[PDB]
Design a protein around this ligand. Sequence first.
Ligand SMILES: Cn1ncc(CO)c1-c1ccccc1
Lengths: 145, 143
Amino acid sequence: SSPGIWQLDCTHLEGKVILVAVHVASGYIEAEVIPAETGQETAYFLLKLAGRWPVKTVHTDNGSNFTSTTVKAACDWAGIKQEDGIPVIESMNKELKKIIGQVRDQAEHLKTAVQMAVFIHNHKRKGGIGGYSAGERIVDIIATD
Amino acid sequence: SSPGIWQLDCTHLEGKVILVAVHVASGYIEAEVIPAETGQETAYFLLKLAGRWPVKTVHTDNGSNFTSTTVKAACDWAGIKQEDGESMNKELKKIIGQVRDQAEHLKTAVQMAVFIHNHKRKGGIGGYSAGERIVDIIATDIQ
Ligand SMILES: Cn1ncc(CO)c1-c1ccccc1
């Protein structure tokens, strides 16, 4: 689908909250542990995302952190179309948790283990030895020239 | 320069620390406000960077934050070569001033500045933004 389309969700592990943005066309992920699923935390994560990739549209789970006017304000500022409650990706949250289990014993804190897992996911060749990683795919899809 | 070379810098503002990474060939920036310039905050910044972009080499200032065993452990794990030997960085500070009033806290103004820097077209019609350049450089290098 469009190069500018992201899906945002949340997943919970060890009592902490991980916000995950998936670039729908490529399966590339961005993720971070945050203190809680608040408006101010969600808006900050989105503003960081939109400053790093060209984000036109976000699909959300319509959680209350999304309905907040702080999130709406960020999205307006960044020119992002927020599509709440609009639905390979339900087992993205599952995929990321698995990878986190494989590195968890190399890091003292969960937040570091999440970043390791993001690194592994985005570098992973899919479709066997002849294939491409989510990382290669997102840049091929969004490059304008 | 090569597609995998970054330069990393700290800058100090309104009483806080900003870590700034410039992708040298594109001028694209990543930045984060951190409470203090520690070896743990550095390593965490570097790992987030390397899971996002193909980081092969980072050029840094001499600081002990870049020297610490945790940054060395992160660099070895992520495959980053470290080397301890600024026009997009004065630029970033200048943008922070121009929008500092658009926002409540520093953290937010910094990410608005990164947004504006990376999306801004340079030159006239036919030009590119830094965000366009990095993606183009790296996509070309893959093919
Ligand atoms: C209406 N709504 N609100 C939140 C969600 C979760 O995507 C949904 C939804 C669930 C399944 C299919 C379509 C929307």
